[PDB]
């Protein structure tokens, strides 16, 4: 009989990529945002060039929306035995109730673990979306502040 190896998202090395936090009110919240305020430095100028000014800018990014799900079906032939309704008094019936309980416990042990793997996969899925290719980024930095 085989066993199952469990994984946890916090003990992976990947966790250091993103900040996780619980939020038991996420179901009601409308589009959530965040705000940015940065200040660009400025250097003085001489002679020909004109006198520059300090610049400010405000910017806001928006939230995404996703989910995760699994399915956990259980059969009636054992569901009867679980609740105790069809549970007759023998020695051949409790031996089957034990089997149904063990089956359900194994199934739930399997499905609950699925969300850790699901999160570890979701992180890769999202990170593989904003990252532009390096080849298209190195020749970008060499030309900054100049595509005017």
């Amino acid at each position: 009989c085989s066993t199952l190896s469990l994984v946890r998202f916090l003990e992976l090395g990947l966790s250091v990529a993103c900040v996780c936090t619980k939020f038991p009110e996420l179901s009601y919240v409308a589009e959530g945002t965040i705000q940015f305020e940065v200040q660009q430095p400025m250097i003085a100028r001489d002679g020909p060039h004109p006198a520059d000014q300090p610049v400010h800018n405000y910017m806001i990014k928006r939230l995404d929306r996703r989910s995760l799900n699994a399915a956990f079906s259980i059969a009636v032939e054992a569901l009867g035995l679980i609740s105790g309704e069809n549970l007759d008094g023998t020695h051949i019936s409790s031996a089957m109730r034990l089997r149904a309980i063990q089956q359900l416990a194994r199934n739930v042990q399997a499905v609950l673990d699925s969300f850790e793997r699901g999160t570890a996969d979701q992180m890769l899925r999202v990170l593989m979306e904003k990252a532009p290719p390096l080849s298209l980024l190195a020749p970008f930095t060499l030309y900054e502040g100049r595509l005017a």
């Binding site: 660009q40 430095p41 400025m42 250097i43 100028r45 520059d52 502040g145 100049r146 005017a148």
Partner: protein, 50 residues
């Protein structure tokens, strides 16, 4: 650093200064050359040869 027999500084001012500002770096110079190419000359009879 040391070069030859001297001790000397060695600096880059891309990150401390000039970073995130609209002033180009005054170390990226501009060489200038002038090319010529004759268009329709004709070589004499002596130096036409496969």
């Amino acid at each position: 650093v040391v070069v030859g027999d001297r001790l000397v500084f060695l600096e880059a001012l891309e990150k401390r200064v000039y970073q995130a500002t609209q002033v180009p770096y005054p170390l990226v110079g501009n060489l200038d050359v002038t090319f010529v190419m004759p268009l329709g000359v004709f070589k004499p009879a002596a130096d036409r040869y496969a």
